[PDB]
């Protein structure tokens, strides 16, 4: 790991002294919250196909810098942020129930341009 990064460049975000562990527990949380959603839902397939690979690389690659190229997500600090954001979205997507057929068709000529 070497000397920890003095700063991530972006004001706000602080350097994470436990990068891999945060990724692992966050990605496991993703697969949990997804698990509470019906399998046929397209949200399940894509999110698990995305997170489980990301969980695969973080476990495999122990070096931080090589990990950054592995997920092409900048530094780790913004990776833990995105993994956190996917957690909130997945936690909020289960109540929204966005897998049934659309609420209703829009009016006849609501689209189409020009009039």
């Amino acid at each position: 790991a070497g000397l920890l990064k003095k700063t991530t460049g972006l004001v706000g975000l602080a350097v994470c002294e436990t990068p891999h562990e945060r990724l692992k527990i966050l990605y496991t949380k993703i697969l949990d919250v997804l698990g509470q959603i019906p399998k046929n839902a397209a949200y399940r397939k894509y999110t698990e196909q995305i997170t489980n690979e990301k969980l695969g690389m973080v476990k495999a690659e122990p070096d931080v810098k090589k990990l950054e190229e592995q997920l092409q997500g900048g530094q780790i600090e913004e990776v833990i942020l995105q993994a956190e954001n996917e957690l909130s979205l997945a936690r909020k997507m289960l109540r929204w129930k966005p897998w049934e057929p659309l609420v209703e068709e829009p009016p006849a000529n609501q689209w189409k341009w020009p009039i």
Binding site: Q49, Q72, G73, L102, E105
Partner: protein, 95 residues
């Protein structure tokens, strides 16, 4: 209105640089305000043959917005490949 050499040193020393090499006030170095008559070029389509508009127009070659799904396994796909982190400068690194 040329400064006396005595104060040429004063302005140069007090600012730690050579002002007289490049001054804000312009002088005879400016381009002349009267210039010879210019001959402007023609465009690429100024050809007296094989310049049919049907093979040259740009407006009549725009299609209506292509429709891909209407309300009337597959790998996850990003809108575009993630950007590549910018490299540090070479001409001037950290200031």
């Amino acid at each position: 209105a040329s400064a006396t050499r005595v104060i040429q040193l004063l302005r140069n020393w007090a600012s730690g640089r050579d002002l007289q090499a490049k001054l804000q006030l312009r002088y005879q170095e400016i381009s002349k305000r009267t210039q010879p008559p210019p001959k402007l070029p023609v465009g690429p389509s100024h050809k007296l043959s094989n310049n049919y508009y049907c093979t040259r127009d740009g407006r009549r070659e725009a299609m209506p917005p292509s429709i891909v799904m209407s309300s009337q396994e597959k790998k996850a796909v990003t809108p575009a490949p993630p950007i590549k982190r910018w490299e540090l400068s070479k001409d001037q690194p950290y200031l």
